[PDB]
Amino acid sequence: AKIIFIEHNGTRHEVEAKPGLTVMEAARDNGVPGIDADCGGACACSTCHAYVDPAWVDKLPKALPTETDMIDFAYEPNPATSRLTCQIKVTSLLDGLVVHLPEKQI
C-alpha cells in the first residue's frame, strides 16, 4: 500500500508499506521526516501525530479514548483530522492514503 506523507511546507514523501505495519512504522522505517515516535507506538508520547487528509478521514477506524487523550497533548491538534499514526494499521484499502505532517512534535 502506498502511503503519502506531506510536510507542513508542502514537501511530498511517498513510501510503500506492507499491510500490518502502522503508518508510524511506514514513516520511521523509510526515513520520512516529521515523525519522532519516541514511545515506539505504545500510544504514550503523541510524537507520531499527523493530520489525515480530509478525503481519507472517513476511511480510517475510529480513534479510541486512549488515543484522543494523547492527541490533546500534541502540537496544534485538529479535532477533525488529527491522529496518532502508530494507531493506524495499514491495509490494502489504505493504498494511496495521504497524511500531512505537523510543523513540530511534542
Q: List contacts with ligand FES (CB under 6 A).
A: 24, 37-48, 70, 84, 86
| Residue whose CB is less far from ligand FES, 6 or 50 | 50
Is 43 annotated in some ligand binding site?
no
| Residue whose CB is less far from ligand FES, 47 or 82 | 47
Q: Per this entry, what is the length of the chain?
A: 106
Nearest distance from residue 35's CB to ligand FES, in Å? 8
8 neighbors 51 (Cβ within 8 angstroms):
no
**Strand ranges across the sheet with 82-84:** 12-16, 2-6, 97-100, 49-52, 82-84
45 neighbors 38 (Cβ within 8 angstroms):
yes
| Residue whose CB is less far from ligand FES, 39 or 98 | 39
- Cα separation, 44 vs 84, whole angstroms: 10
Nearest distance from residue 9's CB to ligand FES, in Å? 22
Q: Hey, is 67 helix, strand or coil? A: helix
Nearest distance from residue 5's CB to ligand FES, in Å? 15
Binding site feature residues for [2Fe-2S] cluster: 39, 45, 48, 86
Binding site feature residues: 39, 45, 48, 86
